[PDB]
Amino acid sequence: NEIVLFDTCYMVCTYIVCNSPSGLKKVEHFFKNILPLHFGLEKDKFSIFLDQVFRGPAAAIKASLKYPSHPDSLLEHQDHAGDTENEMHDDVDKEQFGYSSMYVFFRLFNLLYERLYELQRLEDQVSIIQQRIIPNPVSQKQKIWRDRWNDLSDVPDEKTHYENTYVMILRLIYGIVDQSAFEDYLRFYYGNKAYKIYTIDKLVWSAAKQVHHIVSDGKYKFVTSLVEQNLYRLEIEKLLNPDEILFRFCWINKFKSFGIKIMKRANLIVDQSLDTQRRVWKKYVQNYRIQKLTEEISYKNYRCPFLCRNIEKERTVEQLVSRLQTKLLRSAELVSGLQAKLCLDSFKLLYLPRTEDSYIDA
Amino acid sequence: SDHVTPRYRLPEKAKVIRVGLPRGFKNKGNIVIDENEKPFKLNFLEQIRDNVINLRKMVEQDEQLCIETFSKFDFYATRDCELPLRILCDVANDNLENDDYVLALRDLLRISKWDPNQPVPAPF
């Protein structure tokens, strides 16, 4: 739903520009360069839709508070056009790498999107509840009927109930109408079925806090530069952070899908019983984890034992493993392995004299 | 296993005895305590790729067989509600009809009188 997506982005940027004058240039930079890199939205048209409120019409927009006008469809794609039955192939158009501070932001963005979407989907329940609350002629004749419309404040007049509720959300965000009036509007129109919008203010505040942290945290310029500079696995698992997790973000355009995967997680704290644990646990992981990054303790020295220029340059690191698999399914005589079962000393890696390894490749 | 053992009580000076009788030890089911008595370095995805292709092949064969047996699964499982109606209306004795009549007799709790008829036992 492009409408709901633009509304979510507009809400976060509006909250930032209203409640936080500081860091305004940096938040423009973020919302204008980093987020489109992950969402594949159209650059210039997203720019127009955002500076529709980012630069003037704070008191002017505070007074006006109109519904943000939406442009036409926003779609960006590379040289991949065409779709047929039985071959509706897909591709990870944009693949980025990130950390916890951005993972939380995407999760909050998704929460906000889901709740605005569910809010839009109650248009028929609006009329059902309005029919439910209807005066009784006997009560009117007995002079005991107190209408409920005379309690609402100035209600906006847009085309859609969703737009009216959106203007009300913006009013709460800016700080005009209080929580009581907002909840009373929600109860008059949506009954007791819109109970998830009540904490939309806290949700937007958390999203803006994560945006500010992303853009101005301890390694802010470093991570933003290593993101915006432009095949990045050993170009992304080198830096150090306070025990974070590495994430892979993928965007598919033919389906409008967004995928979050967990890559290697940074190492935990070392222990003293590892000397006795290695006898059973360590070798199990190190051997059964065939060609996969073992993660017990690795921070100290990881001088990459091969230059990155030797590997053939390629995009979409997911297919590098396919290249390796195709290579492995080739002329290699490929004797099994060294068969080095010695840990009785538990201080070093030892081998057996026989059990060489043959022509590993070809 | 303590959910289905008959409860018992051990004294608080109970040396755990190790019974040497290899077979045939009557033990009251519950008082038997813990029954006390290569590194390859493969590093290949060859077997993983082969296993993935094998799984896809098994899946392909299964799907092929099932999707051919469609158009008969439909006829024999979706019209299965009207053939019972046939063998009920035109009362033809099959095993399930007679089991349903046993069900109705067990509901009515007959004793020694004659069974009325196939369509006139009356929990109607």
């Binding site: 509706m88 192939h89 993928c250 | 896809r56 899946v59 392909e60 799907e63 092929q64 999707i67």
Partner: peptide, 17 residues
């Protein structure tokens, strides 16, 4: 047949994630 094989492959491409 080949149609069912194409269906299985397309399902795999569509739900490989």
């Amino acid at each position: 047949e080949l149609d069912i094989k194409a269906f299985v492959q397309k399902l795999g491409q569509r739900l490989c994630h």
